[PDB]
Amino acid sequence: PQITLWKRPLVTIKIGGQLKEALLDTGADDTVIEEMSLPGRWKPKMIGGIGGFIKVRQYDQIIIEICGHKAIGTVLVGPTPVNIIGRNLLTQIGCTLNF
Amino acid sequence: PQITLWKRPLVTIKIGGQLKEALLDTGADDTVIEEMSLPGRWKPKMIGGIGGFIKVRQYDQIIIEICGHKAIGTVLVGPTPVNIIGRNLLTQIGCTLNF
Ligand SMILES: C[C@@H]1CNC[C@H](CCc2c(F)cccc2NC(=O)CC(c2ccc(F)cc2)c2ccc(F)cc2)N1S(=O)(=O)c1ccccc1
Ligand SMILES: [Cl-]
Ligand SMILES: [Cl-]
Ligand SMILES: [Cl-]
């Protein structure tokens, strides 16, 4: 698909058997999801930007379905104000910026 | 151009006759740049990020060139970690997300 930027680019995702709404964010290096359980090992990480930093749990090799496109990668879980699909997963679905 | 997301989508911008590097960010509603002098009056604005909210200065109708494309619009100035081109100006240059 082609997504315009008149509004926030929010899409439905499937992660850990749950349907969630997430923002396609080219400015984010990593994917960050609101608090939820994920299987496997995790390690702590700090991520930051506008407003400062937050502590998150880093889970590796997590499958996410974004607009019917399957992608696998690291998913950070923590107190984010919005679910964010960052570059680590946008590349896997072949997402590009065009102008 | 078509920009992939394996690396940060950094481009050259021109504002106030100066070249600067900026990140194309579909996850940002607005454009925020690091401290610099801009003309005219400014209005107060709060922007929310991963770590919480910050106060910035809102300047309107600012001329800015983004990867050679001319835009004229709102530019926020504040303690942002990097210069960010948000949706308000990405729409002006006709930027879309494609997959
Ligand atoms: C979700 C929004 C919108 N995308 C941008 C940003 C990403 C934050 C983020 C995630 F969400 C998830 C995972 C990682 C990160 N951080 C980075 O990737 C670091 C990165 C960065 C930091 C702060 C920034 F402002 C913008 C980019 C960085 C780039 C170059 C450097 F040299 C150093 C750092 N957030 S924001 O701060 O809250 C916000 C920015 C503007 C307006 C509203 C909100
Ligand atoms: Cl990854
Ligand atoms: Cl590619
Ligand atoms: Cl604007």
Swiss-Prot record, chains A, B:
Residues 1-5, 49-55, 88-99 are annotated as: Dimerization of protease. The active site is at D25 (for protease activity). Residues 20-89 form the Peptidase A2 domain. Aspartyl protease that mediates proteolytic cleavages of Gag and Gag-Pol polyproteins during or shortly after the release of the virion from the plasma membrane. Cleavages take place as an ordered, step-wise cascade to yield mature proteins. This process is called maturation. Displays maximal activity during the budding process just prior to particle release from the cell. Also cleaves Nef and Vif, probably concomitantly with viral structural proteins on maturation of virus particles. Hydrolyzes host EIF4GI and PABP1 in order to shut off the capped cellular mRNA translation. Homodimer, whose active site consists of two apposed aspartic acid residues. This is Protease.
